[PDB]
Amino acid sequence: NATANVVDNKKRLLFVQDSSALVLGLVAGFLQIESVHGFIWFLILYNLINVIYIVWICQLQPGKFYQSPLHDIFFESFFREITGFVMAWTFGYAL
Amino acid sequence: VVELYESLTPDERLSNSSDNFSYDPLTGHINKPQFQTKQFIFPEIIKTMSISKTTDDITTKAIVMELENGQITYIPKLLLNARGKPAEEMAKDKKKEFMAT
Amino acid sequence: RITPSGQFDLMSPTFEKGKLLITIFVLLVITYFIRPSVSNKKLKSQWLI
Amino acid sequence: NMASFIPQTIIMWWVNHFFAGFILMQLPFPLTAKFKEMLQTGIICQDLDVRWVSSISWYFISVLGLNPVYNLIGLND
Amino acid sequence: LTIEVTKDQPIIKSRSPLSERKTVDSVIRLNEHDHQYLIKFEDKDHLLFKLNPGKSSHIFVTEHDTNGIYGYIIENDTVKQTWKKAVNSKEKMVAYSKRETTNLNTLGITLGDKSVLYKYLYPNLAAYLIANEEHHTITF
Amino acid sequence: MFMYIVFQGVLMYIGYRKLNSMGLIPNAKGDWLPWERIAHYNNGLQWFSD
């Protein structure tokens, strides 16, 4: 049914998400965002970047490039990206 | 050394209702204290005493003493601990404190 | 001047900066020297070209 | 797990040796008091805060959050 | 005297007497913004003093002697005796101290098992020692 | 299929009960202490002294 080409585009998504969780947080630490506003800010901007990724790079068809796309873009690698955001936010708040 | 607490039961505000009460001290309605006291022995005659100050009073108060010799020595308030125990009853006493002296 | 709780705001007058820079430089050079060996040996031996 | 056990213990050893009895920063989020017990080992105060941390806290976060940096600099399994 | 402190050598800009020319025992600074002072003359006479701009809201004062602790109330720019705690013929007060104002960082000391004792914080307190002969005792 | 959900819930709840509930969770009274008030004792008085 499916081939072993999902790994490549999955890796591209992972690179995009990783590179969009260490400039968020750093920006938050530059603005001296406080405890809960920071988390709400991160959730809003991170899901916005996921949506614009679904629109722009993926051509409005999450299927045909991932299987179960709502599971794979949004919920997968979410607790591996809140923590990188926390690291960058702590690094930014201390400068 | 005597230390003053609102109530000695481990979780109680017997008084000090803080929401909207607007206490009136001149009537005498205020809450009254409870206290715990201890005594210590020092070698040398202490001529006078003071307590140190900082910008925000976070660090320990460092009771500072001028002796009869003129030498000046301080001891932190952590050493002068009321509610202390003889270090036999401090072992595996979960209720005590963090780093109970 | 007295410091009842120790001096934690100002770091130290006896900080060992040179040992820390020596550790960083040792790690940097050992990585830079071990990288060609692992790269060439394992990548060219695992595919048996 | 030797891969887990060797380097994290070595780094804890190095951090507790070189960086002790300091206040490094304040975290942006309020922890609970047992984290004041865990994180402020350097200092012997009693009411400083929970939000003010010694140097070891910077390791306790950097262990969890370094995966994206390792991915970006270029590494593979 | 009123003195102008400058980076250079200061200047004594004013000298003048008080209203009553008696020997001065002590001076207490009253509220900062009203620029008041309570002056205790030997012979134990109290004068309220309002110097210059520096160019019910009761106010309470407390004086102590070797004979006891006295207390006063300042109302309508006049001083009034309010109570007295005087020692006996053979007692003599030796040490006295006031509660210094302190920034409040934590409201209670916390125990292991995370219970909190809620330390007593009431601002208007004073402590003193009475030394008694004829029983050889020290009272706090 | 709900057996998998319930079992994974038990595996999610064992960690909460056994290890995070030792001292690292609120609903203790010693955790809401930094969000309590002072009661503003005098509110009309000064009390200067020596």
Ligand SMILES: [C][C][C][C][C][C][C][C]C(=O)O[C]([C]OC(=O)[C][C][C][C][C][C][C])[C]OP([O])(=O)O[C][C]N([C])([C])[C]
């Ligand atoms: C390990 C990651 C770091 C997570 C720390 C939580 C950060 C969110 C946070 O600050 O919420 C705090 C954490 O107060 C507490 O410390 C209680 C924790 C409540 C969550 C427990 C989860 C089981 C509680 O909400 P709050 O409204 O009662 O506090 C006052 C408002 N605030 C100043 C916080 C804006």
